[PDB]
Structures are given as structure tokens and as C-alpha cells.
Amino acid sequence: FSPRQNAVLDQALRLLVEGGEKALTTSGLARAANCSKESLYKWFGDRDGLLAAMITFQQSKVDRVSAPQLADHLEVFAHDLLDVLAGDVSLALNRLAIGQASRDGSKLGDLLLERGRRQIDRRARGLIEAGRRSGYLRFDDAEEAYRSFYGLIVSDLHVRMLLGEAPDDFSARAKKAVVAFLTLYGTEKVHSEL
């Protein structure tokens, strides 16, 4: 997107964080962003295209290592992840998609399951593969290793925050999760080097 297209998506996000779903309309967006209803329609298409673009916009903001670098990158990842999940945009997008879901989900729900954490997940994959390549980590399947790491870092905190609980010291948490993750997937080489 352009810097101006970017400005508009930022308005759309802000509308949703501030005034919920009621506020997120084409007209409210046209008014908030001082953009013709008409340009919104050609830039993003329908309501679904806008929601999609909003999610990719919010994505925009997201070889070999030593053992200390690995541990440290992994800790930075976990801290950044928690910061994202605790953030008001992420909480608002997920609350909207979840709040409106039935047994059958919702369209916004589809979009977040598809693209809502793409750049985070890619960063995790990259880091975990480098760790494996450098002989520091051993696992049969990178998806499974990442599933474990995510669970260790987050546990039930995302749901709890979605329900209105004020977050947990993310730095301490990121530390603890990386120690557990290296116990499960860490190689003799990573432990003897650290």
C-alpha cells in the first residue's frame, strides 16, 4: 500500500479499537479518513477486502547463530509475541472476530486464522530452523517445535486477556519459556555451549 492508503487503514484500525464494530463502517471510515466512499471501494473492494487489508496492514508493523545468540533471539521473539497479543489492536481484532463467531466461526475469524499472525510465525520458523541448522536444536517437525514454544510462552494468557484480564513482566516470562524450550528441543551442543 501507499503511505496514504496506509493512513486510511490506520484510521480503520483506530475506529475499531476505539468504537468497536458499530464504528467500523464504510461511511464512518470515509468520514474519519476524509476519503471518498468511492476510493475505499476501488482500493480494498467490499467490506471483506478492507478487513483483509486491515490485517495485512497491521502485519506491516511486525545465517548461523551462536548458542547465546540463539537463546537471546528466542527470548526477544517471546517478549515480542506477548507484546503483540497484549496489544490493543490485536485484542480488538480477536475480540471482534471471536465475539461474533458461532459454532460456524465468522468471516473475520477466517481472515485471522489465515493471516493474523503470518509475520510472527515466519520469524519463529526462521529462528527455529537456524537453531536446528546450527546443531543447537533437534526436532522431527518444526511446526510441532513451534507449537510447544508458543504454548510455553503464552499458555492461557491470550484467552485470559481476551476475557479482560490485565497482562502479566513479559521479560521474565520470555526467559522462563526459552529455558523450557531448550530443555525440550535443546541439543547437548547448546547446553554445553551456554
Residues forming contacts to a copy of itself in the complex (CB under 8 A) are 17-23, 88, 91-92, 94-106, 109-110, 112-113, 144, 147-148, 150-156, 158-160, 162-165, 176, 180, 183-184
Q: What is the C-alpha separation between 152 and 67, in angstroms, rounded?
A: 20
Minimum Å gap between C-beta 172 and a copy of itself is 11
- C-beta of 42: minimal distance to a copy of itself in Å? 28
Give least dist CB 168 to a copy of itself, A: 10
Query: Residue 90 or residue 134: which is nearer to a copy of itself going by CB?
Result: 90
Which residues in the chain precede a discontinuity of more than 2.5 Å between C and N? 62, 168
CB nearer to a copy of itself: pick between 4 and 107:
107
Q: Exposure pattern of 129-157 as b/e (b: 16+ CB <10 Å)? A: ebbbebebbebeeeeebbebbbebbbeeb
Min CB(2)–a copy of itself separation in Å: 28
- Give the three-state DSSP class for 105: strand
How far, CA to CA in Å, does 68 sit from each of 79, 109, 178, 182? 17, 38, 12, 12
Neighbouring CB atoms inside 10 A of 181's CB total 25
* Residue nearer to a copy of itself on the CB measure, 4 or 113: 113
Nearer to a copy of itself, 69 or 106 (CB): 106
Pick the closest to residue 53 from 72, 65, 71, 39 (CA basis).
39
Nearer to a copy of itself, 2 or 102 (CB): 102
Q: How far is the CB of 120 from a copy of itself (least distance, A)?
A: 11
Nearer to a copy of itself, 49 or 66 (CB): 49
Residue 22 C-beta: closest distance to a copy of itself, Å:
7
Give CA angle at 80 (75, 82), nearest 5°.
100
Give the chain's largest Cα–Cα span: 62
